[PDB]
Amino acid sequence: AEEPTFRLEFKDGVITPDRLEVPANTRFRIELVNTGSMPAEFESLELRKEKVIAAQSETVMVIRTLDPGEYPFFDDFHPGGTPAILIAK
Ligand SMILES: [Mn+2]
Ligand SMILES: [Mn+2]
């Protein structure tokens, strides 16, 4: 594996970890693991990125590149859940 790979757990709107530092200007992967009972949707407004993860399932999201900066994200299917963030640096 020559690509950095991170992991986020989604569980009924709670995202862990809620803060993820990632490299900027770099292609990388995030394993999105939904351990809850409802489908989840990774969504970031700024990045225009949305990815569904069915309950009790996993999918691996590819981020092609991020300019340095901070990118809030959340489970769009569970409003009021964790406001998480990617910190690209
Ligand atoms: Mn959505
Ligand atoms: Mn929404």
Author numbering: 44 to 132
Paper's wording?
FtrABCD is a four-component iron transporter found in several Gram-negative bacteria. Previous data confirm that FtrABCD can only utilize Fe2+ and the inner membrane permease, FtrC, from this system, like its eukaryotic homologue, Ftr1p, is predicted to utilize the free energy released during Fe2+ oxidation for the transport. Periplasmic FtrB from this system is coancestral with known copper oxidases, and the conserved D118 and H121 are predicted to bind to Cu2+, forming an active enzyme. On the other hand, we and another group predicted that periplasmic FtrB (10 kDa) is a novel cupredoxin (Cup-II) based on its common ancestry with Fet3p (a multicopper oxidase) and other single-domain cupredoxins.
We investigated the validity of this phylogenetic prediction by crystallizing recombinant wild-type apo-FtrB from Brucella abortus 2308 (see Materials and Methods section for details about making apo-proteins from as-isolated proteins) from 100 mM sodium acetate (pH 4.6), 20% (v/v) polyethylene glycol 3350, and 20–100 mM MnCl2 supplemented with 20–100 mM CuSO4 and obtained diffraction data at 1.30 Å resolution. The final refined structure (Rfree = 19.8%) at a limiting resolution of 1.30 Å was produced. For example, structural fold analysis of FtrB revealed the presence of nine β-strands, resulting in three β-sheets through H-bond interactions (Sheet1:1–2–4–7, Sheet2:3–8–9, and Sheet3:5–6). Interestingly, the electron density that can correspond to the presence of copper metal close to the D118 and H121 residues was not identified. This can be due to several reasons, such as the pH of crystallization being 4.6, where the side chain of H121 would be protonated and hinder Cu2+ binding (pKa for H121 in FtrB using ProPKA 6.5).21 Second, acetate being a competitive chelator for Cu2+ and being present in such a high concentration under the crystallization condition (100 mM acetate and 10–100 mM CuSO4). In contrast, diffraction data from wild-type FtrB crystals showed that two large peaks of unmodeled density above 5σ were found in the Fo–Fc difference map and could be modeled as two Mn2+ ions with high occupancy (Mn1 = 0.88 and Mn2 = 0.71) and low B-factors (Mn1 = 15.54 Å2 and Mn2 = 14.20 Å2). Coordination of Mn1 is mediated by side chain oxygen atoms of residues E84 and E86 (from the EXE motif), E93 (from the RKEKV motif), and D119 and two ordered waters, resulting in octahedral geometry. A second Mn2+ (Mn2) is found 5.3 Å from Mn1, near the loop connecting β-strands 5 and 8.14−16 Surprisingly, only a single coordinating ligand originates from FtrB (i.e., D119), with five oxygen atoms from ordered water molecules acting as the remaining coordinating ligands, resulting in octahedral geometry. Despite this flexibility, all FtrB conserves E86 and E93 residues, which are seen to coordinate to a Fe2+ mimic in our crystal structure, and we conclude that FtrB plays a crucial role in iron transport.
